[PDB]
Write a protein that binds this ligand. Sequence first.
Ligand SMILES: [Ca+2]
Ligand SMILES: [Ca+2]
Ligand SMILES: [Ca+2]
Ligand SMILES: [Ca+2]
Ligand SMILES: [Ca+2]
Lengths: 189, 218, 218, 189, 189
Amino acid sequence: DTGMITSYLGGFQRTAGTTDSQVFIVSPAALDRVGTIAKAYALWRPKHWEIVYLPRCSTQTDGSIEMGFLLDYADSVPTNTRTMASSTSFTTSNVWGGGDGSSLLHTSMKSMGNAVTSALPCDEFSNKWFKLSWSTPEESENAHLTDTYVPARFVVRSDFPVVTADQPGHLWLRSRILLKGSVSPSTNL
Amino acid sequence: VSRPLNPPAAVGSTLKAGRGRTAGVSDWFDTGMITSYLGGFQRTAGTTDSQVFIVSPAALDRVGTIAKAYALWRPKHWEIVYLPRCSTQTDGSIEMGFLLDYADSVPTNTRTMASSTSFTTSNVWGGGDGSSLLHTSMKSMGNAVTSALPCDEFSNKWFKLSWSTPEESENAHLTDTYVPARFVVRSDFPVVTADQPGHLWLRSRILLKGSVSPSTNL
Amino acid sequence: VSRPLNPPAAVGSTLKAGRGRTAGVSDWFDTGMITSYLGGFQRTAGTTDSQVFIVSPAALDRVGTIAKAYALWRPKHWEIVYLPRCSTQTDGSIEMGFLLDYADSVPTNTRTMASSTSFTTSNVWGGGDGSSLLHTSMKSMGNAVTSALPCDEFSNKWFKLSWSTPEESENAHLTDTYVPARFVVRSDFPVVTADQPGHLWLRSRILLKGSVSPSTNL
Amino acid sequence: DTGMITSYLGGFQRTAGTTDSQVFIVSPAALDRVGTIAKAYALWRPKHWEIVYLPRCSTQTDGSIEMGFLLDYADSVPTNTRTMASSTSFTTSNVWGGGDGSSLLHTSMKSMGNAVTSALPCDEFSNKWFKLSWSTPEESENAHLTDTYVPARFVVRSDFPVVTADQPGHLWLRSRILLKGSVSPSTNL
Amino acid sequence: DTGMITSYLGGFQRTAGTTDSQVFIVSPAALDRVGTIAKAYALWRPKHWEIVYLPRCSTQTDGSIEMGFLLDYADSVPTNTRTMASSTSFTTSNVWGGGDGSSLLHTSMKSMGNAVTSALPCDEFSNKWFKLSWSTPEESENAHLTDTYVPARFVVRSDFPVVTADQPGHLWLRSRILLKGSVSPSTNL
Ligand SMILES: [Ca+2]
Ligand SMILES: [Ca+2]
Ligand SMILES: [Ca+2]
Ligand SMILES: [Ca+2]
Ligand SMILES: [Ca+2]
């Protein structure tokens, strides 16, 4: 058991003229510390996987951010807000809100207050062991196949198109996972 | 007489859906024991001929659209009941069973069919008592002809709701990852003229979990 | 030791579905007070510009597919709440209201909009208190900016669930027979650059009645 | 439940190439008895799967044997001692020893003495059922897909590349599995 | 806590010089798996660090192996049997034996039989934390300084100077350590 670990997931990017839509595969692979530790193991299971958004913009900034999870790799990614609002653990807030979530990064408290978070319901995987993968899914790979080793996908969206591109905030991950099975990091793919 | 005003720099909010329902629909749902029409028992001329029914919520007509609002599902009970509707002068019998591996081949004779999971057979005009099992939660009894999928093997699994049918090009091993099982019905008596001596009713119960936009659900 | 046998001439049954459910789904359904996303408040450059939302279960994303399993429906409550998400330096206001006759024209100015049913207006950064109304059954209070359709006019009517959008060629009088009403949102302040200062949330409750196969439901 | 059963897995083959390692798929398919019995069932679960190495050579034979498991079909096969050592249930020993393991073939006790064994940690599959397959994984089959019906792969390699090919010992398997669901043997693929 | 982990330490190399002894620094740095895992932490503490020697040669091989630990970086490395015998956890045995130790690689039991092992007495570090280092001690570095971040040195030597260099056996490490404090792997030096 790794315990709760905080990882920088990436920034919240807003490209001009189009509504942003970043998709993150739920895997330790890319995480600075977790990714490294995980490489020495063959299997893993998510116990807690919650993303907390922290703003870095001015209160004058317009727009909101929308977050949620997709549990079937075959399901398509939401293109509008109404659709996004039906996803798992949907959360939305002004692009400048969420500052109260700061403490969640070094604590284990439950998201509360004006915190902007979205947590993957991990009860779904309490009996499964996923094989740790370090490669990106092929374009040609059948969705049903990918779904077998991808717990879920995390989606981040912008509610409306901006004139000028910017990065309103940061996406942080609080995760706790179980690692099992011995393998050489170099042979772990 | 006078009230203070101190507007914020901006106004907004933070939405986090999830009481246990998203967008007005529960995030978890149990259908309970329900009864619906599966299909008719069709008799034809080829011996190889058999009917195959994939275990999926898509088989439920009304329940189907409801399931479309969920991401995962699990079979808690899936039992087929055969109801005869023919003269007792009708020859032949019916054979039913389940195939748990999408890779396994479909039985083409009685000897082989008899080895399928929850196999059961009967003369085509038998099983009349089964009609009392419909719409009730009673347990099989009388000459009732039934076949129930042992759902204990899925008690830890969560299948993703898939709405498209498996292609030909699809590797059986892959199809097997999202298809709990296949139900097979066979006639041991090839007939000259096609007919339908009885019907197949489904007594099932499934769990639906995880919110998702119906239109994005594939 | 010996049991008598006296087979019938034929065997069969009589099925009559209808406990209060057909094919495993109730024949009547009440959603209760639910909350879902309607759309964003979009500001543009034309003055005539206004957004129109047709009152229909199709507006509910998850509830939509469920409704597809029913033939009739009735609005018991349909109220829109405006939630601001912008700087308090944002100029302009928002105007909302309902049109009860599909034939009536859409308002193009404030004077006219003000006469719509359940009309309400406010500066675009006002209505912050409305966020507490979401997911709850509380009643409007605080600076909450809301507009509720007086559903008492439909308490005897049963609308047929229609899934296709009204055509152009369709006579307004005809469209009016299956569209309870239209909700209109207008900006009084034309802007240089399009933006979205706030959002529109829907607090509703509808009744669904009558069993029907989802695929045949149009 | 089959109970414990001893099966001849094959011989330990030493050759001239370096990246020469034998790989066995964890499945009842090829087993003399277990294979026949399993044919009548649709699903299976490994409760115990342990390989015991037994010598058949002179005490003058140099070199050692290395065994271990790969839990992800996508992981690559170790090519040197350093990385083989990181496989699951890794074990190693000189090529002519391991006699204390012979009794493990009719007993059910645990590996002790100089016995050379490698036991797959089956607690990983305690909650799932695999569909019995009798065909060999296609060449073109996506590793991720093969992984779905292959519990694990067992790997055996030499550290001492030899001049003349030989067979220093035998690989014995003592397993115990659960079978579930009936199916006609001739239908079982 | 990493739990017990098996790592390939290297081979037992015999050469022509007499004062020829292999020296290993007690650290996770070079270990295949432990090294990767440790990279994500800033501090560590050895809970168990034991080396097991395993043969790979003919029973005709003459000579013996000697292993032990040096707890002070300033102490000199033994050059003969008499003084090697005084090292910490000293152990010795002929070069072709030690087979009873193979099971210690997947077990957690204690050295018994003809097993050849040397376990560092870790009760010495039960109250301290070492800062994980990944660089090799400078040549010019004062021994006293190096001693501050090196728990101990493990020494292996032959008593039988050979004519032709060879490798009679392998050196295996089974360790268990505690890691504490987070740090970015790429930042960890
Ligand atoms: Ca892997
Ligand atoms: Ca789906
Ligand atoms: Ca209709
Ligand atoms: Ca099979
Ligand atoms: Ca360091």
